[PDB]
Amino acid sequence: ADTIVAVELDTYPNTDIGDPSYPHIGIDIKSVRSKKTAKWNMQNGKVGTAHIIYNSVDKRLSAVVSYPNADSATVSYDVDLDNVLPEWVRVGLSASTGLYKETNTILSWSFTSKLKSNSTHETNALHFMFNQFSKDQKDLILQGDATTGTDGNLELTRVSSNGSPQGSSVGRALFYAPVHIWESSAVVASFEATFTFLIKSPDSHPADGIAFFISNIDSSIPSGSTGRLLGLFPDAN
């Protein structure tokens, strides 16, 4: 019942649900079966950076994911998000572990949304930036196992004191304020997101991934959306 648009950093290849046979980045429109993917040379224990951009003129959602000293991966999909998402949405980060696992640590997260009308000098805009997350983060909605304040970080999935990730975990953080991605007099609407992330696993096979998403405002973690479903989807349709 939730409507989900997402960019996925999928760390575990579930080839039965259309994943390529490698860690990849994907654009997901209302399904975990990415409309478009690109190989991603994920680096266990390194701080990666994800960038997501879109506008209403190009109607192209794109993402680039990089680490220091490495080539980047990029993926794009032509989609009019005004025909997918409602006029008001929330934006968030989601992550999961299954029988395979990893830390899903967010060190920073920023977002900008702009609606520009045909009115002279009439931009509407939201921008937030989190470089340091705190124990009691009132401008975030945390769902599932997501916690804030450990080392100034957002831990999307469960991690023990000692610092090792737990399997079968799922968590999300959504920005408190609803975001307006369309208005009747808009001539261009754009958003961008950036997050930095540290995926570390004691295992050779980490799972399952991190996603930036945009949903209906009332979105919650669907049942059984641990593991391959990334805390985003009720199933693999």
- Which position among 86, 117, 141, 150 is part of the footprint of ligand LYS (CB under 6 A)? 141
| Beta carbon of residue 92, minimum distance to Ca ion (angstroms, whole number) | 19
| Beta carbon of residue 141, minimum distance to ligand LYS (angstroms, whole number) | 4
Residue 26 binds which entry of Ca ion, Mn ion, ligand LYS, none, with Cβ cut-offs from 5 to 8 Å by kind?
Mn ion
140 binds ligand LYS (CB under 6 A): yes
Phi-psi region of 107 (alpha: psi -120 to 50; beta: other; left: phi over 0): alpha
Residue 206 binds which entry of Mn ion, Ca ion, ligand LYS, none, with Cβ cut-offs from 5 to 8 Å by kind?
none
| Beta carbon of residue 175, minimum distance to Ca ion (angstroms, whole number) | 25
Smaller CB separation from ligand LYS, 121 or 138: 138
Residue 21 labelled as part of a binding site: no
**230: Cβ–Cβ under 8 A, 6 or more apart, which residues?**
6, 8, 10, 32, 94, 95, 96, 208, 209, 211
Smaller CB separation from Ca ion, 109 or 233: 233
What is the binding site for ligand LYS (CB under 6 A)?
Answer: 138, 140-142, 176
